[PDB]
Amino acid sequence: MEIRKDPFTGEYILVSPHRLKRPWQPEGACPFCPGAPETGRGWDVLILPNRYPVVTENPPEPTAEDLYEVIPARGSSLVVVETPQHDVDDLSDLPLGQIKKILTAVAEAQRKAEKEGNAAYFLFFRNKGKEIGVSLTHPHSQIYILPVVPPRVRAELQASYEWYVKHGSCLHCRIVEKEEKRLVFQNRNWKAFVPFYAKWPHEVHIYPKRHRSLLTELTDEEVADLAEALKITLCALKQVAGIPMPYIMVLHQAPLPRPTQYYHLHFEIYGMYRPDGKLKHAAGAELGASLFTLDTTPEETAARIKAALQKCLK
Amino acid sequence: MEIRKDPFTGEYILVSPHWQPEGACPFCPGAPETGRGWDVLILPNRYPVVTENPPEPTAEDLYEVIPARGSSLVVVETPQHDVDDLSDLPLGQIKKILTAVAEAQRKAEKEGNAAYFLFFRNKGKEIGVSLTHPHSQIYILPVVPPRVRAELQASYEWYVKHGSCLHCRIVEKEEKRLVFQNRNWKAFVPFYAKWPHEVHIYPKRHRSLLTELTDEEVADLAEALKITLCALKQVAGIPMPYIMVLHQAPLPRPTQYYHLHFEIYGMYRPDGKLKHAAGAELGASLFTLDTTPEETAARIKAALQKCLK
Ligand SMILES: [Fe+3]
Ligand SMILES: [Fe+3]
Ligand SMILES: [Zn+2]
Numbered sequence: 011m012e013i014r015k016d017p018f019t020g021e022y023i024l025v026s027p028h029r030l031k032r033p034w035q036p037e038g039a040c041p042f043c044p045g046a047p048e049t050g051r052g053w054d055v056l057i058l059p060n061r062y063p064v065v066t067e068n069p070p071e072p073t074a075e076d077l078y079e080v081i082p083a084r085g086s087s088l089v090v091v092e093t094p095q096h097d098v099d100d101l102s103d104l105p106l107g108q109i110k111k112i113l114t115a116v117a118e119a120q121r122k123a124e125k126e127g128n129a130a131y132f133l134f135f136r137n138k139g140k141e142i143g144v145s146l147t148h149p150h151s152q153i154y155i156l157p158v159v160p161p162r163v164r165a166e167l168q169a170s171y172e173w174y175v176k177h178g179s180c181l182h183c184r185i186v187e188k189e190e191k192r193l194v195f196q197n198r199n200w201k202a203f204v205p206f207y208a209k210w211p212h213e214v215h216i217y218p219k220r221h222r223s224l225l226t227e228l229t230d231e232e233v234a235d236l237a238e239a240l241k242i243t244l245c246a247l248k249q250v251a252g253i254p255m256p257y258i259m260v261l262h263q264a265p266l267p268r269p270t271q272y273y274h275l276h277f278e279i280y281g282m283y284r285p286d287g288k289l290k291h292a293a294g295a296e297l298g299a300s301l302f303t304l305d306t307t308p309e310e311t312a313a314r315i316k317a318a319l320q321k322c323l324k
Numbered sequence: 325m326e327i328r329k330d331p332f333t334g335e336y337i338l339v340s341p342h343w344q345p346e347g348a349c350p351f352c353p354g355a356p357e358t359g360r361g362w363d364v365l366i367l368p369n370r371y372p373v374v375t376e377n378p379p380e381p382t383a384e385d386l387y388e389v390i391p392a393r394g395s396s397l398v399v400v401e402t403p404q405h406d407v408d409d410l411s412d413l414p415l416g417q418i419k420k421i422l423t424a425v426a427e428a429q430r431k432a433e434k435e436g437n438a439a440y441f442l443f444f445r446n447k448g449k450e451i452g453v454s455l456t457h458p459h460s461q462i463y464i465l466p467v468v469p470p471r472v473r474a475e476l477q478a479s480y481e482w483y484v485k486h487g488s489c490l491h492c493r494i495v496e497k498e499e500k501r502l503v504f505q506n507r508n509w510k511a512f513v514p515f516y517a518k519w520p521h522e523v524h525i526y527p528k529r530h531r532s533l534l535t536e537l538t539d540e541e542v543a544d545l546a547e548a549l550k551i552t553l554c555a556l557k558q559v560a561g562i563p564m565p566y567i568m569v570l571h572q573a574p575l576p577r578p579t580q581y582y583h584l585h586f587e588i589y590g591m592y593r594p595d596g597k598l599k600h601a602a603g604a605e606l607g608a609s610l611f612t613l614d615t616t617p618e619e620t621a622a623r624i625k626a627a628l629q630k631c632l633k
């Protein structure tokens with residue numbers, strides 16, 4: 011177990027071996043349902059340790075090799091169990107107040123991590139869909155509390171700082187305020203749009219209208235309007251294809267625990283069906299060279315998304 | 325159509341808006357674009373992501389946009405439709421595939437426009453390869469792919485600091501993770517492997533561009549690819565889908581700090597289920613492994629012994 015580093019890309023690899031279950035080994039009882047000694051009862055939201063953590067509190071001594079940088083796999087890997095119900099398809103299927111509690115519980119986990127003062131980064135994300143390898147069907151999300159900043163966020167951080175120095179302001183605010191044609195949804199505190207620089211077949215970024223760099227700075231009405239943002243956007247993506255779409259959601263926010271004027275937090279949602287509902291796989295172009303292609307303009311895709319989003323209201 | 329640029333990550337997006345008989349293969353011999361009496365072809369892609377005469381790029385106020393100017397090609401690797409993998413083909417056939425790609429790169433080098441020549445191959449229905457007929461893709465590009473750009477910086481910077489090629493140094497020290505070598509090439513699982521079955525194939529001589537390769541090096545490349553890809557085909561029980569990409573320098577001047585290599589990402593975990601790049605990977609560029617690169621190198625190397633031939 012250790013965090014290795016790629017000397018050409020700077021990307022980190024969370025090496026944490028665990029034995030892999032054989033095809034004759036049952037999947038076994040849902041690890042996220044209430045009523046087991048692990049899970050307890052009477053809860054709405056359960057944050058618990060991942061069964062196979064990629065970062066741990068007292069990690070083994072890192073494997074070393076002369077030319078390479080290795081960091082101890084230190085921190086927390088957690089599962090946010092989003093509801094006690096097993097057969098709900100999606101986060102978007104849950105009631106607004108249930109979404110609020112999930113968000114509030116995540117915010118609160120971040121506070122704990124902030125206070126504690128070690129963890130460099132709080133990474134919240136969600137994978138959805140059998141077709142992208144989500145075998146555990148019970149709605150859930152993930153938190154990694156990390157000793158390092160995620161390389162992708164680290165790159166966004168540098169480019170953000172360098173525009174703030176040059177022009178005096180945050181580029182994200184400037185981008186959010188200007189954008190309206192590619193708008194998918196907005197309310198008192200959040201804007202959700204297909205970015206100009208979209209890479210995935212149905213992409214939406216969700217920004218707060220006010221400049222927040224950290225989850226923990228959100229006002230209780232911000233957190234509430236966020237639940238509504240997430241619900242309706244996710245609902246739009248669940249309906250646009252004609253069949254529920256697999257998707258990846260990540261929270262991009264500043265490192266722990268001090269705020270920033272140049273970086274502005276956002277949720278990125280990569281919806282992984284093309285317009286015709288066949289799956290889009292990240293292949294040689296994407297994984298091999300970080301080159302993306304789109305068979306359809308982002309502007310046209312915001313339309314389809316916004317049009318399908320109309321059905322969701324109710 | 326145009327190439328858009330992500331202002332936060334530096335990444336490029338190739339935006340390009342877009343009846344035939346069932347059982348028709350557009351890469352099969354006797355096709356409208358193919359003809360007959362051929363062993364290998366490099367064709368224009370039917371729905372190219374770059375082209376020679378691209379329309380005016382769609383400009384936006386806060387973003388950089390560049391014309392979608394380049395060549396998108398398919399490499400039909402064989403006339404036979406029914407061959408599963410590049411690695412089922414004989415050494416001589418793989419030699420003509422390599423040679424063809426090299427000649428097309430030389431052409432692109434001489435013509436003097438293209439910034440980058442990107443050769444890659446996707447394999448397997450599970451990762452979206454719906455045209456089963458053995459093929460490879462070339463993108464001749466007006467920019468340097470961002471992952472390759474990054475590798476260049478970091479190799480450049482190391483070179484300046486330590487006065488030698490980091491890649492040449494890395495290749496010398498590979499023993500434990502070695503999977504195969506021959507006269508001109510080494511194949512190993514890198515210490516920094518991020519996919520479940522990753523193998524990089526490097527030339528022993530320092531080379532930066534495919535077109536510098538000698539006839540003997542090409543022949544030995546043919547073999548290294550065959551045996552390595554044979555190893556990954558066998559390692560999990562059934563044929564494994566995979567991605568292969570050639571990381572080489574920009575066109576057309578050789579680099580002392582960068583050293584060409586092929587990366588192969590075999591996408592089954594040891595258990596034989598498909599790994600998908602997800603939120604950690606796409607959303608954060610963090611990668612996880614459930615098995616050490618060392619143990620995986622041993623598993624591949626053990627599977628590879630069956631392939632020596
Ligand atoms: Fe972002
Ligand atoms: Fe590389
Ligand atoms: Zn359950």
Ligand SMILES: [Zn+2]
Binds near residue numbers: 181183271273
């Ligand atoms: Zn801002």
Ligand SMILES: [Zn+2]
Binds near residue numbers: 352404405
């Ligand atoms: Zn064919």
Ligand SMILES: [Zn+2]
Binds near residue numbers: 489491581582583
């Ligand atoms: Zn070298």
